[model samples]
Target: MDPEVTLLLQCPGGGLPQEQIQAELSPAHDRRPLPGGDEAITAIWETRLKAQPWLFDAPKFRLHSATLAPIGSRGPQLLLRLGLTSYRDFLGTNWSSSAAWLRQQGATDWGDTQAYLADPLGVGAALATADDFLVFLRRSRQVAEAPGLVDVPGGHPEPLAGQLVVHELFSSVLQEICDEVNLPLLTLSQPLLLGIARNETSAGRASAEFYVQCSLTSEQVRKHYLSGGPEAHESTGIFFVETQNVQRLLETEMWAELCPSAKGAIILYNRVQGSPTGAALGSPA
Candidate 1:
């Protein structure tokens, strides 16, 4: 099995204090060329970062599989905690400039290696209803790139304020959903581990796509989606479409509109839930 791929049916919430971990773990690290990558791409990225002091080549540690079996399980669950340790470049920025640089250096379009590269974690609830699965329509005006795109809500998992732990990632997931969907964390159903996806662009950058399950009905999630607020800040509204429709989107629109991570979430989800959606894509779910 691929080292980055970890299969879990429960939560194993424990980690060595990061300081003691063998590899360097920090919020930011100096930018350097990806091992064996074209120097031209690195040059373009460095040029962009030189002026933006706020941004850093923030270093991230791909989680190591310390052990399993004695893991933490409050109840029946499945946790997909895949860690990607690729050598692709994961710069922290909108890569339009870098992309243009790549095309200039013998690539087709932004779809190639020179495009986006960042560490983003995915989190979504599998709120399956008798008729449909819940979905979101992202609003077009936001602080991040691709302001208007559709997917389960998620983003980069950062250190809160104090010590950081792998388990706390769940807290961050819930918090982002509340911020994006405008629902109280309490009102939302308890989340179950659906699956986890570790991804990166074809050029070789680290990407994270994590999935979870919830039991909220389509109507309840809709009301909150309609009650526009900071939580709804990132989406125009929400949808409770059928699994078939979602599967079609996955097939016709993987990586479309700069939302590959969103695509990853749905793909990971179908697999974990005995996979009706995955079957639609002709892949074993």
Candidate 2:
């Protein structure tokens, strides 16, 4: 939420080919990595939770480019690319060790913040139905990493070794979705790839964020996110705002707390929704 950081999505004119993106993750692109020893790869994120650990992996993959790459689309139809590095930690307000780690690297006025071209790939579900797209706010101050913010259900890709495979990506995302929302994979529908987003944040983290959709009915999604739902502790409760109203909230700082992965999910919900009902207000272009 710092004015200094900018969150953006890189959707080039014609959109990026899934193949090119895949190449970047595979042996095809072969991005570079620094030669530091293993101990140098670990990170300590001193958020309110205190020193959350992270394994800084340099061998798994490399940056797509020092510059952010443009990727313009998302959906379940999106292919899975191998060798992309998803950091062990998610970003929140930049804490201690990581901030100092950044400073030691010659970054000034910089928090422990980071911005990798294409960061982590994640999934989102439009907990709507015969009704609204569900969104939620984190009530606990413990979310100090993320603090008080609005975000849809999402998470990053898990580490994958061995031969690259599609099921690995799907399985990783499915598990995360189930873990975060406590919903069975069967209860979910097809995933609509929403494209990649570039995140600029103060949370000592940033990466190429992926956005995707979970096409589950409201009733189904509603049952699980009822606060008593799976991992309900992560948030206060799900806010199932009507289509138009959900659109409206996106505009007015109503969902003022921000995160690029969630931001894209909300946008996709509106785009796919294509209509409003039951006191539905709306947002801007």
The candidate maximizing TM-score is 2
Worst 10 residues of 2 by lDDT: 276-285
Q: Write the per-residue lDDT of candidate 1 for residues 67-87, one digit (tens) a residue.
A: 222333452223222233222
Cα error, candidate 1, residue 119 (Å) = 4.8
Provide the global lDDT of candidate 2 against the true structure: 0.41
lDDT for every model? 0.43, 0.41
Global fold similarity of model 1 (TM-score): 0.54
Q: C-alpha displacement of 232 in model 2, angstroms?
A: 5.4
